[PDB]
DNA sequence: CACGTTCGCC
DNA sequence: GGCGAACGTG
């Protein structure tokens, strides 16, 4: 039947098919970082939404941390990406979400709208409950986007570190 | 500072 | 083209 196994591969295969900005040596970071913290945030049973207050400036710590592409701290490009996704809800906001292109008036929209947000609850609780979906999405996400980079600091901050840091000695 | 334009890429 | 994005250019 439907499994998180199957789940999970739906959950990558989404996860893979987004299409980051990319840099002259990588792609850039702002939809992995959004997603681990969300990995994380799931991981922990945490609430699944949250004020955009709280989304801003959580995200915007890890983006001015952990940022190695020179990425500000800008949490509405990839939240509005993973929205058109379908991997992240908005709520409390009226007439749709735009899409990450642009600059001023994305910034401008989360101001005014200041929607309510999370990852979509399909993902979140299974990222939840299975171990196996977090490491998948991790390796994943390290692979794809952290490919010369040291992913520990932002391991630590979303408190994944024992399931992204694979052993190789 | 804010907007219109530009870059990289499927 | 469209979108995920940074950046002149006032």
Do not use: C, M
């Amino acid at each position: 039947p439907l499994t998180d196994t199957d789940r999970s591969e739906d959950f990558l295969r989404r996860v893979r098919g987004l299409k980051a900005a990319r840099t002259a040596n990588g792609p850039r970071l702002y939809q992995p970082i959004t997603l681990l913290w969300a990995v994380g945030r799931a991981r922990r049973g945490e609430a699944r939404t949250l004020a955009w207050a709280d989304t801003d400036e959580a995200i915007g710590a890890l983006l001015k941390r952990h940022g190695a592409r020179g990425e500000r701290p800008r949490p509405d490009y990839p939240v509005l990406a993973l929205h058109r996704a379908g991997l992240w809800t908005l709520e409390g906001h009226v007439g749709e979400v735009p899409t990450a292109h642009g600059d001023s008036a994305l910034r401008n929209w989360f101001a005014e709208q200041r929607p309510v947000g999370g990852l979509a609850e399909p993902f979140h609780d299974l990222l939840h409950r299975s171990g196996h979906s977090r490491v998948s999405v991790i390796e994943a996400l390290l692979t794809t986007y952290f490919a010369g980079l040291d992913p520990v600091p932002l391991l630590e901050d979303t408190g994944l570190y024992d399931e992204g840091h694979h052993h190789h000695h």
